[PDB]
């Protein structure tokens, strides 16, 4: 599946329709559906970002 | 380009004997090769070529066509 995800996305929606002078993309692709999910996802993302910063600082 | 104020090395129009002989030999070989290809040519050729005809700017084309009709009717009557 991840062998073909990239070409599958490009076949579903090309580069020119996504960004550029002739782009038709209006809705983004989100991993959240509700405001509560967005808040939880944001706080988990901040925690993961801080953890990775600490790992790179230790390394 | 700065050709006038600073010209480059000239290109010699003076030939050499070796180059002349090689060019003549290769021209004769190409002539023989195209003769062979003309002999072995698979392309279709018409038995009679398409004649261009009478030019339009010729002033007496219409009277010439009148004549041509006259000899074709005369030949049809004679035959």
């Amino acid at each position: 599946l991840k062998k073909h995800q990239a070409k599958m996305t490009i076949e579903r929606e090309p580069f020119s329709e996504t960004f550029g002078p002739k782009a038709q993309r209006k809705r983004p692709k989100l991993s959240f559906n509700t405001v509560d999910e967005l808040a939880g996802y944001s706080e988990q993302s901040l925690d993961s970002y801080h953890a990775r910063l600490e790992e790179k600082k230790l390394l | 380009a700065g050709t006038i104020n600073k010209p480059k090395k000239p290109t010699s129009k003076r030939k050499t004997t070796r180059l002349r002989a090689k060019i003549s030999k290769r021209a004769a070989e190409k002539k023989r090769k195209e003769r062979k290809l003309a002999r072995k040519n698979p392309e279709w050729r018409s038995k009679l070529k398409k004649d261009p005809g009478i030019p339009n700017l010729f002033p007496y084309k219409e009277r010439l066509l009148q004549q041509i009709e006259e000899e074709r009717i005369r030949r049809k009557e004679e035959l």
Partner: protein
């Protein structure tokens, strides 16, 4: 004075005529008659 606008802004330029170096060799009536003969022969 002139009433029109010239595109390049050189308003002093005169009203130029067409560059026809072969002008005046043949007449209009003779050319019409030659047109008729040409169409018939074609």
């Amino acid at each position: 004075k002139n009433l029109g606008m010239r595109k390049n802004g050189q308003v002093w330029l005169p009203a130029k005529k067409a560059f026809r170096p072969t002008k005046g060799l043949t007449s209009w009536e003779l050319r019409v008659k030659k047109r008729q003969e040409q169409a018939a022969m074609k």
